[PDB]
Ligand binder design. Structure first.
Ligand SMILES: Nc1ncnc2c1ncn2[C@@H]1O[C@H](CSCC[C@H](N)C(=O)O)[C@@H](O)[C@H]1O
Length: 274
């Protein structure tokens, strides 16, 4: 049912899929037959970009699997496969920590903005390592700075009480700390047995509508409140957050309705030996 909120999110994550595919080396791979996995695919933005960037290639030269833990999202990708006529693509519900795909028969695994969500991140790395063929590549990205958070911070400041609010580091570190750091990420892939691990940081500058920024912040408010507010603060003031965000958005960005944004993700790649 939280499919409607991923529809807003995918407007942003689309800006990060091309660098993921470029980083992976897929467009210059001599591995054959190409067998790709869009792991934790959400609404399938990586799969979208794969079919665009591979448009010149013989459609029989590659196949794609899309997997997500959610059945609503998988079903969305499955309807996309059918509507767009992706005959070489299939979608299935799967757990990234234990995919039940066959050992050593993928050439590339792509996992965009997902690894921080995995409760056992090492188990997901070993599984992806297992399902890759020798010489195959795992390519991932994770958020490091997402600038909607600061717009919400400013909104919360206008609330008539000094209320706690997390910094980017405190927020990003809520689950799986360290994945917002390119050096930590590289070490984790190296410790799992990937070789030729490379890590970097990539920013995108874009504009988002005030309305879209509201819809992004709304599902995250109860999470922020539960972890950084006392229960007394939650019960006295949570109902004030959304009204103040809307008020702050229009007063600050209402002339054009556009919010300039700069988000940064770490990207990383690792290879299975041989
Ligand atoms: N253990 C797990 N196995 C597979 N998918 C998982 C998972 N835990 C969370 N997810 C999925 O990970 C996604 C994170 S959002 C990232 C979505 C997409 N790759 C994009 O770029 O927009 C969500 O769709 C969620 O359903």
């Amino acid at each position: 049912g939280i499919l409607e909120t991923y529809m807003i999110a995918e407007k942003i994550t689309r800006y990060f899929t091309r660098d993921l595919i470029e980083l992976s080396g897929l467009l210059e791979s001599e591995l054959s037959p190409l067998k790709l996995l869009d792991l934790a695919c959400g609404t399938g933005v990586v799969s979208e970009r794969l079919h665009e960037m591979l448009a010149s290639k013989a459609p029989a030269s590659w196949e794609l699997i899309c997997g997500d833990i959610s059945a609503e999202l998988t079903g969305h990708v499955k309807r996309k496969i059918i509507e767009e006529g992706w005959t070489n693509s299939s979608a299935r519900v799967m757990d990234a920590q234990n995919t039940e795909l066959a050992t050593a028969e993928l050439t590339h695994v792509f996992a965009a903005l997902a690894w921080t969500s995995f409760p056992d991140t090492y188990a997901a790395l070993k599984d992806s390592l297992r399902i890759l063929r020798p010489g195959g590549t795992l390519t991932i990205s994770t958020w490091q700075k997402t600038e909607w958070l600061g717009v919400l911070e400013a909104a919360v400041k206008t609330i008539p009480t000094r209320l706690p609010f997390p910094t980017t580091k405190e927020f990003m570190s809520c689950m799986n700390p360290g994945w917002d750091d390119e050096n930590y990420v590289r070490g984790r892939l190296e410790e799992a047995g990937f070789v030729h691990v490379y890590s970097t940081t990539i920013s995108k500058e874009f504009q988002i509508s005030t309305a879209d920024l509201y819809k992004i912040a709304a599902p995250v408010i109860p999470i922020i409140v539960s972890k950084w507010w006392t229960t007394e603060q939650k019960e006295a003031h949570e109902h004030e957050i959304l009204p103040a965000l809307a008020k702050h958005l229009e007063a600050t960005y209402g002339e054009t309705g556009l919010v300039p944004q700069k988000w940064t993700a770490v990207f990383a790649k690792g290879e299975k030996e041989k």
